[PDB]
Amino acid sequence: FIDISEEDQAAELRAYLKSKGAEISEENSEGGLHVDLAQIIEACDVCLKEDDKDVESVMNSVVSLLLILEPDKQEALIESLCEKLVKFREGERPSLRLQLLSNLFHGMDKNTPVRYTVYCSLIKVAASCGAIQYIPTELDQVRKWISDWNLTTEKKHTLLRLLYEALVDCKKSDAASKVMVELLGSYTEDNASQARVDAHRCIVRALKDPNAFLFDHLLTLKPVKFLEGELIHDLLTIFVSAKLASYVKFYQNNKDFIDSLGLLHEQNMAKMRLLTFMGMAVENKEISFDTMQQELQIGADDVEAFVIDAVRTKMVYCKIDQTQRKVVVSHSTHRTFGKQQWQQLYDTLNAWKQNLNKVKNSLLS
Amino acid sequence: FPGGRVVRLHPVILASIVDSYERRNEGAARVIGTLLGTVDKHSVEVTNCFSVPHNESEDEVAVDMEFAKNMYELHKKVSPNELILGWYATGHDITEHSVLIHEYYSREAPNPIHLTVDTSLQNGRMSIKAYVSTSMGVPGRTMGVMFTPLTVKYAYYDTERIGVDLIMKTCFSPNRVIGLSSDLQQVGGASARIQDALSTVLQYAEDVLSGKVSADNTVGRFLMSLVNQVPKIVPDDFETMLNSNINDLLMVTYLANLTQSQIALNEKLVNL
Amino acid sequence: GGSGDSAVKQVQIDGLVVLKIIKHYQEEGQGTEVVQGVLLGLVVEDRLEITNCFPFPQHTEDDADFDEVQYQMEMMRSLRHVNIDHLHVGWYQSTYYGSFVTRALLDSQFSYQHAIEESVVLIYDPIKTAQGSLSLKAYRLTPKLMEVCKEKDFSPEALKKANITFEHMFEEVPIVIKNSHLINVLMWELEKKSAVADKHELLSLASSNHLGKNLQLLMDRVDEMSQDIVKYNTYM
Amino acid sequence: KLCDNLRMHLSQIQRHHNQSTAINLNNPESQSMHLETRLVQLDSAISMELWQEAFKAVEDIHGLFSLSKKPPKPQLMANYYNKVSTVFWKSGNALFHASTLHRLYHLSREMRKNLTQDEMQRMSTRVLLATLSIPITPERTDIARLLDMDGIIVEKQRRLATLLGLQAPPTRIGLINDMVRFNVLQYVVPEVKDLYNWLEVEFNPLKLCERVTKVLNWVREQPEKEPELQQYVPQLQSNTILRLLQQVAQIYQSIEFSRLTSLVPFVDAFQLERAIVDAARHCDLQVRIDHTSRTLSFGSDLNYATREDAPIGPHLQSMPSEQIRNQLTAMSSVLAKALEVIKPAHILQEKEEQHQLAVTAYLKNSRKEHQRILARRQTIEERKERLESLNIQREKEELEQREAELQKVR
Amino acid sequence: MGDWKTCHSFIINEKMNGKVWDLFPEADKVRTMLVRKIQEESLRTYLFTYSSVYDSISMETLSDMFELDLPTVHSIISKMIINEELMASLDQPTQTVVMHRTEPTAQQNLALQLAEKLGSLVENNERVFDH
The whole-angstrom distance between residue D148's C-alpha and the CA centroid of its chain comes to: 24
Instruction: Write the DSSP assignment of C126-179 as a string of letters.
Output: SGGGTS-SS-EEEE---HHHHHT-S---SSTTHHHHTTS----S--B----SS-
Instruction: Give the pairing type, strands C37-43 and C88-93.
Output: antiparallel
Residue of C38, C56, C14, C4 lying closest to C115 (CA atoms): C38
Q: Which residues contact A80 (CB under 8 A, 6 or more apart)?
A: A47
First to last CA, chain A: 68
Q: CB of E119 within 8 Å of any CB in chain B?
A: yes
Chains near E (3 or more Cβ pairs under 8 Å): B, C, D
Residue of B34, B32, B24, B21 lying closest to B55 (CA atoms): B32
Residues 126-165 of C with CB under 8 A from E: none
* D288 contacts on E by Cβ (under 8 Å): 53-56
| For E130, nearest residue in chain B (alpha carbons) | B269
Q: Are A146 and A187 in contact, with CB atoms under 8 Å apart?
A: yes
Q: CB of E115 within 8 Å of any CB in chain C?
A: yes
Kindly list the distances between the CA atom of residue A28 and the CA atoms of A46, C88, D333, in Å, as whole numbers in the listed order: 11, 71, 72
How far is Cα D9 from Cα D6, in angstroms, rounded to an integer? 5
Alpha-carbon distance B239 to nearest alpha carbon in chain E (angstroms): 19
SS3 for chain B is: CCCCCEEEECHHHHHHHHHHHHCCCCCCCCCEEEEEEEEECCEEEEEEEEECCEEEECCEEEECHHHHHHHHHHHHHHCCCCEEEEEEEECCCCCCCHHHHHHHHHCCCCCCCEEEECCCCCCCCCCEEEEEEECCCCCCCCCCCEEEEEEEEECCCHHHHHHHHHHHHHHHCCCCCCCHHHHHHHHHHHHHHHHHHHHHHHHHHHHHCCCCHHHCHHHHHHHHHHHHHCCCCCCHHHHHHHHHHHHHHHHHHHHHHHHHHHHHHHHHHCCC
How far is Cα A15 from Cα A32, in angstroms, rounded to an integer? 9
How far is Cα A293 from Cα A297, in angstroms, rounded to an integer? 5
Nearest to E57 among D270, D290, D303 (CB): D290
How far is Cα A249 from Cα A241, in angstroms, rounded to an integer? 5
How far is Cα E58 from Cα D277, in angstroms, rounded to an integer? 13
| For D155, nearest residue in chain C (alpha carbons) | C62
DSSP class of residue D140 equals P
Q: How many CB contacts within 8 angstroms connect chain C with chain E?
A: 16
Kindly list the distances between the CA atom of residue C43 and the CA atoms of A128, C112, D308, in Å, as whole numbers in the listed order: 58, 18, 54
Amino acid at A134: Y
Helices and strands in chain D: count of H runs, count of E runs: 18, 2
How far is Cα B233 from Cα D394, in angstroms, rounded to an integer? 71
Rg of chain D in Å (alpha carbons): 32
Q: Are D306 and C219 in contact, with CB atoms under 8 Å apart?
A: yes
Residues 18-47 of B with CB under 8 A from A: 42
The whole-angstrom distance between residue A75's C-alpha and the CA centroid of its chain comes to: 25
Residue of B179, A320, B165, E45 lying closest to C200 (CA atoms): B165
Tell me phi and psi for residue E100, to 5 degrees: 60, 50
Q: Which residues pair with B114 in a beta bridge?
A: B87, B131
Q: Do B229 and D348 touch (CB under 8 A)?
A: no
Count of CA atoms in the C-beta half-sphere (13 A) of E14: 6
Strand boundaries in C2-161, DSSP class E: 10-13, 37-43, 47-55, 59-60, 64-65, 88-93, 120-124, 136-139
Q: Are D319 and A311 in contact, with CB atoms under 8 Å apart?
A: yes
Q: CB of B197 within 8 Å of any CB in chain A?
A: no
* Helices D346-406 and B180-208: angle between axes, nearest 10 degrees: 170
Q: CB of E120 within 8 Å of any CB in chain B?
A: yes
DSSP class of residue E52 equals T
Kindly list the distances between the CA atom of residue B110 and the CA atoms of C126, D75, D194, in Å, as whole numbers in the listed order: 38, 35, 44
Q: Do A347 and B203 touch (CB under 8 A)?
A: yes
The experimental technique behind this entry is: cryo-EM
Long-range CB contacts (within 8 A, 24+) of D140-149: D141/D282, D141/E1
Sheet holding E89-91, edge to edge: E56-58, E96-98, E89-91
* C215 contacts on D by Cβ (under 8 Å): 325-326
Geometric angle at alpha carbon D258, from D255 and D261, rounded to 5°: 90
How far is Cα A28 from Cα A277, in angstroms, rounded to an integer? 73
Residue of D62, D33, D37 lying closest to D50 (CA atoms): D37
Q: Do D395 and C84 touch (CB under 8 A)?
A: no
How far is Cα C206 from Cα A93, in angstroms, rounded to an integer? 40
Tell me phi and psi for residue B131, to 5 degrees: -140, 155
Count of CA atoms in the C-beta half-sphere (13 A) of E44: 15
How far is Cα A54 from Cα A57, in angstroms, rounded to an integer? 8
Q: Do D283 and E55 touch (CB under 8 A)?
A: no
| For B226, nearest residue in chain D (alpha carbons) | D336
Q: Torsion-angle region of residue A189: left (phi > 0), alpha (psi -120 to 50) or beta?
A: left
Amino acid at D31: Q
Classify burial at A23, counting beta carbons within 10 Å of its beta carbon; exposed 0-12, middle 13-18, buried 19 or more.
Answer: exposed
Q: CB of D325 within 8 Å of any CB in chain C?
A: yes
Q: Are C95 and C226 in contact, with CB atoms under 8 Å apart?
A: no
Q: CB of D207 within 8 Å of any CB in chain A?
A: yes
Long-range CB contacts (within 8 A, 24+) of C27-34: C28/C60, C29/C60, C29/C61, C29/C62, C29/C64, C30/C96, C31/C62, C31/C96, C32/C60, C32/C61, C32/C62, C32/C63, C32/C64, C32/C95, C32/C96, C33/C64, C33/C95, C33/C96, C33/C102, C34/C58, C34/C60, C34/C64, C34/C93, C34/C95
Q: Torsion-angle region of residue D95: left (phi > 0), alpha (psi -120 to 50) or beta?
A: alpha
Tell me phi and psi for residue B130, to 5 degrees: -120, 135
Residue of B47, B255, B16 lying closest to B155 (CA atoms): B47
Choose, out of C36, C185, C193, the residue to mutate when testing the contact with B (most B CBs < 10 Å): C185
Q: CB of E124 within 8 Å of any CB in chain B?
A: no
Q: Which residues contact B173 (CB under 8 A, 6 or more apart)?
A: none
Q: CB of C223 within 8 Å of any CB in chain E?
A: yes
Alpha-carbon distance C55 to nearest alpha carbon in chain E (angstroms): 38
Residue of D1, D5, D50 lying closest to D30 (CA atoms): D5
How far is Cα B66 from Cα C81, in angstroms, rounded to an integer? 13
Kindly list the distances between the CA atom of residue D124 and the CA atoms of C196, D118, D190, D223, in Å, as whole numbers in the listed order: 50, 11, 10, 16
Geometric angle at alpha carbon C185, from C179 and C189, rounded to 5°: 115
How far is Cα B178 from Cα B181, in angstroms, rounded to an integer? 9
How far is Cα B116 from Cα B121, in angstroms, rounded to an integer? 16
Q: Are B44 and B34 in contact, with CB atoms under 8 Å apart?
A: no
The whole-angstrom distance between residue D107's C-alpha and the CA centroid of its chain comes to: 19
Helix ranges (DSSP H) in D69-189: 72-92, 94-115, 120-133, 143-147, 151-164, 172-181, 184-187
Strand boundaries in A201-359, DSSP class E: none
Three-state DSSP state, D349:
helix
> Is the backbone peptide bond immediately before B59 cis, with ω within 30 degrees of 0?
yes
Q: Are D230 and D90 in contact, with CB atoms under 8 Å apart?
A: no
How far is Cα E131 from Cα E127, in angstroms, rounded to an integer? 6
Residue of A308, B141, B122 lying closest to D319 (CA atoms): A308
Tell me phi and psi for residue C21, to 5 degrees: -65, -45
Q: Are E77 and E97 in contact, with CB atoms under 8 Å apart?
A: yes
Residue of B170, B150, B167, B151 lying closest to B159 (CA atoms): B167
Q: CB of C229 within 8 Å of any CB in chain E?
A: yes
How far is Cα C140 from Cα C118, in angstroms, rounded to an integer? 9
Instruction: Write the DSSP assignment of A30-83 as a string of letters.
Output: HHHHTT---SHHHHHHHHHS--TTS-TTHHHHHHHHHHTTSSS-HHHHHTSSTH
Q: How many CB contacts within 8 angstroms connect chain B with chain D?
A: 73
Output the CA torsion D196→D198→D202→D204 (10° steps).
-140
Q: Are A84 and A64 in contact, with CB atoms under 8 Å apart?
A: no
* C226 contacts on E by Cβ (under 8 Å): 108, 111-112, 115
Tell me phi and psi for residue B149, to 5 degrees: -75, 140
* B223 contacts on D by Cβ (under 8 Å): 340
| For D353, nearest residue in chain C (alpha carbons) | C191
How far is Cα D332 from Cα C209, in angstroms, rounded to an integer? 6
Classify burial at A112, counting beta carbons within 10 Å of its beta carbon; exposed 0-12, middle 13-18, buried 19 or more.
Answer: buried
Q: Which residues contact E84 (CB under 8 A, 6 or more apart)?
A: none
Instruction: Give the pairing type, strands B146-154 and B6-9.
Output: parallel
Nearest to D303 among E3, E65, E104 (CB): E104
Three-state DSSP state, E38:
helix
Q: Are B104 and B63 in contact, with CB atoms under 8 Å apart?
A: yes
Tell me phi and psi for residue B154, to 5 degrees: -95, 130
* A310 contacts on D by Cβ (under 8 Å): none
> A199-236 burial, b for 16+ CB within 10 Å, e for fewer?
bbbbbebbbbebebbbbbbbbbbbbbebbeeeeebebe
> D165-183 burial, b for 16+ CB within 10 Å, e for fewer?
eeebbbebeebbeebeebe
Output the CA torsion E102→E108→E111→E116 (10° steps).
-130
DSSP class of residue A225 equals G
The whole-angstrom distance between residue D240's C-alpha and the CA centroid of its chain comes to: 19
First to last CA, chain B: 77
Q: Which residues pair with B44 in a beta bridge?
A: B7, B39
Q: Are A63 and B146 in contact, with CB atoms under 8 Å apart?
A: yes
How far is Cα B264 from Cα C230, in angstroms, rounded to an integer? 15
Nearest to C198 among D159, D323, D342 (CB): D342
| Chain E interface with D: residues with Cβ < 8 Å | 1-3, 46, 49-50, 52-58, 61, 65, 94, 96, 102-104
Q: Which residues pair with C65 in a beta bridge?
A: C59
